[PDB]
Amino acid sequence: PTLQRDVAIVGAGPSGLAAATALRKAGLSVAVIEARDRVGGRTWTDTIDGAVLEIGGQWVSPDQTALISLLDELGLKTFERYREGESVYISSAGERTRYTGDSFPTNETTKKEMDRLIDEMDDLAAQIGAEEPWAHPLARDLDTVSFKQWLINQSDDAEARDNIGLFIAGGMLTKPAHSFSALQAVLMAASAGSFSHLVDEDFILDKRVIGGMQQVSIRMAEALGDDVFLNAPVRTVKWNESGATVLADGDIRVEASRVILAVPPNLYSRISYDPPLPRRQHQMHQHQSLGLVIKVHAVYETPFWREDGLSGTGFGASEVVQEVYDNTNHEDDRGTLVAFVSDEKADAMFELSAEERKATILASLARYLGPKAEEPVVYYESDWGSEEWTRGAYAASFDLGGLHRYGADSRTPVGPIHFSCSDIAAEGYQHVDGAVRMGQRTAADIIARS
Amino acid sequence: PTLQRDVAIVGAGPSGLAAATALRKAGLSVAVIEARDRVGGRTWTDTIDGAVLEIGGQWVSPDQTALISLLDELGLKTFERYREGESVYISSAGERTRYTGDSFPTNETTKKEMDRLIDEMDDLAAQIGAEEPWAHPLARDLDTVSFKQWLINQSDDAEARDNIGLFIAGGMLTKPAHSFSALQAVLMAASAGSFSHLVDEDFILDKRVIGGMQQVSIRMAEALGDDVFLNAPVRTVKWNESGATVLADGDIRVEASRVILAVPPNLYSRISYDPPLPRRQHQMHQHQSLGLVIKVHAVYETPFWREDGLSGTGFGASEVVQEVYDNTNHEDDRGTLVAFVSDEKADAMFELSAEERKATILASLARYLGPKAEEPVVYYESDWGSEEWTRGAYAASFDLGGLHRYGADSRTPVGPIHFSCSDIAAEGYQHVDGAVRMGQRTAADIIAR
Ligand SMILES: Cc1cc2nc3c(=O)[nH]c(=O)nc-3n(C[C@H](O)[C@H](O)[C@H](O)COP(=O)(O)OP(=O)(O)OC[C@H]3O[C@@H](n4cnc5c(N)ncnc54)[C@H](O)[C@@H]3O)c2cc1C
Ligand SMILES: Cc1cc2nc3c(=O)[nH]c(=O)nc-3n(C[C@H](O)[C@H](O)[C@H](O)COP(=O)(O)OP(=O)(O)OC[C@H]3O[C@@H](n4cnc5c(N)ncnc54)[C@H](O)[C@@H]3O)c2cc1C
Secondary structure (H helix, E strand, O other): OEEEEEEEEEOOOHHHHHHHHHHHHOOOOEEEEOOOOOOOOOOOEEEEOOEEEEOOOOOEOOOOHHHHHHHHHOOOOEEEOOOOOEEEEEOOOOOEEEEOOOOOOOOHHHHHHHHHHHHHHHHHHHHHOOOOHHHOOOHHHHHOOEHHHHHHHHOOOHHHHHHHHHHHHHHHHOOOHHHOEHHHHHHHHHHOOOHHHHHOHHHHOOEEEOOOOHHHHHHHHHHHHHHEEOOOOEEEEEEEOOEEEEEEOOOEEEEEEEEEEOOOHHHHHHOEEEOOOOHHHHHHHHOEEEOOEEEEEEEEOOOHHHHHOEEEEEEOOOOOOOEEEEOOOOOOOOEEEEEEEEHHHHHHHHOOOHHHHHHHHHHHHHHHHOHHHHOOOEEEEEOOOOOOOOOOOOOEEEOOOHHHHHHHHOOOOEOOEEEOOHHHOOOOOOOHHHHHHHHHHHHHHHHHHO | OEEEEEEEEEOOOHHHHHHHHHHHHOOOOEEEEOOOOOOOOOOOEEEEOOEEEEOOOOOEOOOOHHHHHHHHHOOOOEEEOOOOOEEEEEOOOOOEEEEOOOOOOOOHHHHHHHHHHHHHHHHHHHHHOOOOHHHOOOHHHHHOOEHHHHHHHHOOOHHHHHHHHHHHHHHHHOOOHHHOEHHHHHHHHHHOOOHHHHHOHHHHOOEEEOOOOHHHHHHHHHHHHHHEEOOOOEEEEEEEOOEEEEEEOOOEEEEEEEEEEOOOHHHHHHOEEEOOOOHHHHHHHHOEEEOOEEEEEEEEOOOHHHHOOEEEEEEOOOOOOOEEEEOOOOOOOOEEEEEEEEHHHHHHHHHOOHHHHHHHHHHHHHHHHOHHHHOOOEEEEEOOOOOOOOOOOOOEEEOOOHHHHHHHHOOOOEOOEEEOOHHHOOOOOOOHHHHHHHHHHHHHHHHHO
């Protein structure tokens, strides 16, 4: 079929759907064209071996105000993650200690080093900000030193530097600390409101949506009706100063005034542009890449850790699994754990056989919470790296030096072509809240233009 | 058209063509499918305002034995870049000094610092090698420190550091030194035979091809006749354990036992694979990127610098133009300069208007060679970044950390899909010679079974 719209939107993830919804609200007509047999992108709720799981993005923090309004507008409610009782910390030397409150139970030197670093990171984030971190006069020096090297320049305490890295490198950017810059650590902190917010799992991992995060996309898409096309990878964008024509599988053709690429940046060159994008985009898009993380799901007869006085939360920068949390579904009698295996530790697990990998990850949940972690009734690993329409998790970031070099260009339109995804967001960078903000910002930009 | 072939080859650059050439000798049949209206890829000879220029790759060094051997087989000869008389050095203090001989005319202390850093890089390259630098016991620590931070650790002398950087960062990888690892520097050095080989423009930039480097591809492609398809971007590869179908524009459909992707790695995902490549390829390919450099060409009625006793060679790590060389065509009476503006300096020139960029570049050329450099008869800038089928220059390298993490996987086949370009080569990495070696290494693999 051939259609005529004011805006063609490539990608029916939360970012494209939020842009579509805002455009519709303002009276513009839209078509959203999606590759997969479903909407939601990196958010997805599925049933595996009888257990309902969130395969992707799921948590809402209190600074995610754009996602919180959108939830309210769609009739969706939240619930809080279980946090009663003791958390577990595993030290660099391998000592396992139960604790409550909000510092790790390390020796005092380490604790004071961590506090000081948290404070320095909060300070940098408040000064530099998430809107245009590259523009600050401190930015050049921060963007040309790796986060690993910057931590070495700040502190002699190995354990403190490893735990600070746990929160940014394994915990957010899903890349090793030697491979992105101090500035990129600052941006990640600023985007979430402060580094202290990313440190406190009670803040950044506070709530979930009743019915799952994918419902945010599913409900936006339901309201768009026949203007959403599924099973339709977009292959070609033909453009000029006044116009873009978008071509997709199934003989789909959309003639639009503007196009929104609502896809992560590592995937822009999956589409052919006629004429080609300018040199600056050709170069910039090469320097953007997704991290890699395994999101592990483990379902048990009950949340057994709660009988032992444990919250289910566990941190260990030297473990294969660096984080574990209670991920029990709203009103479920069965318990579910969630755990994360990050970057180079993920590659290492994927090189083991499926059997050996499972055994290694369950051994590690057992190190945190006890030998009952070893007996789930359902076990599943989210595998976003294999998915050709994602190719990693959670989200994309520049290589080292790319944030200062290309950051000012990452949202600029090219003629009628706009860009919108969480991976180029300011507040809410990498999160559904960022996807939502960017979709709304791109919509408002198009509306003013037209 | 639909055709059957033993091997379908995507890309008619030197790597694809060298592979097709080797495959035919064994009696395997081939189709070589090429996006552009020409062969050669990053090699290309063109005529701008009536003056002939090598828009891309052009120089041959004595360690480039796969290339040299191929030139002989194709009946092509070489000539040497003019090098008589004095070179020019521009110091960090902006001081300009004519010199000859094998080191920069700096003070003795800076000279000792440079020498020590060159010996250190030679030693690392000799221990580590180009074949699998990631497997060496020193590899992890070299690959997690940037080259800039490694230089800072080795030497406190900023002029000596910037000068070593000139040869590797602006001069090869065309990325700034804070963005790639020490191990990647060591690779670049091992791949050319040593770091000293890259410091000596009389080695790395020794010879050119009579008739132009593009002739290497042109001749190879001529011998293949109707098995080369031009103006045919490949869009899809459908594959299983025993075979592939390759689909290109113009309704080309090639059914084959093996496919070679003879394209730089930042372009692999311009193609759809059915079923998708595995996760490890999905990830690795995102971590590969081309550098950026403006190859500047300036043509004058004579090689005027030779009249002032200058070789045409100039170096200055702080200039916008960090290098200038005599690039006079074989038996032309007109003189031609070649010059390079690398990485973030290229981004900054591209941000000015064309007129202001040209004046800024020619001002810098004038500082090396005199006010005559500012009145060329023909001026041209190679723009590979704008080409959708290249998108940068000279070649691709990992981001920081990628070489150790992914290196061992960069040549591995996926089922019947093989990978062959200069950007994944061992010896000859990033150069025509590496493209030839990889093309021949891939063909030998497929041939042997
Ligand atoms: C395991 C995991 C855990 C995460 N944790 C959370 C968390 O707890 N909280 C949170 O808020 N965020 C989290 N995130 C991140 C969050 O899911 C993403 O930031 C957000 O989904 C990004 O949305 P987007 O619309 O910007 O891109 P995406 O959701 O990736 O959507 C892009 C869409 O475009 C489609 N597409 C791509 N190319 C084409 C093409 N050529 N043609 C047609 N369609 C195309 C894709 O199929 C996809 O549907 C997590 C993600 C993962 C994977
Ligand atoms: C400014 C510049 C200066 C250089 N300096 C030197 C030097 O002097 N000496 C030296 O040895 N090397 C030099 N190089 C590097 C050298 O030219 C490259 O190493 C070499 O050409 C690599 O050859 P290749 O076959 O691996 O890839 P390429 O030459 O890039 O060829 C790949 C081919 O694939 C085609 N292609 C890509 N995608 C598709 C697709 N989907 N479908 C069909 N076709 C496709 C492209 O059009 C291209 O023709 C220079 C390069 C440049 C750009």
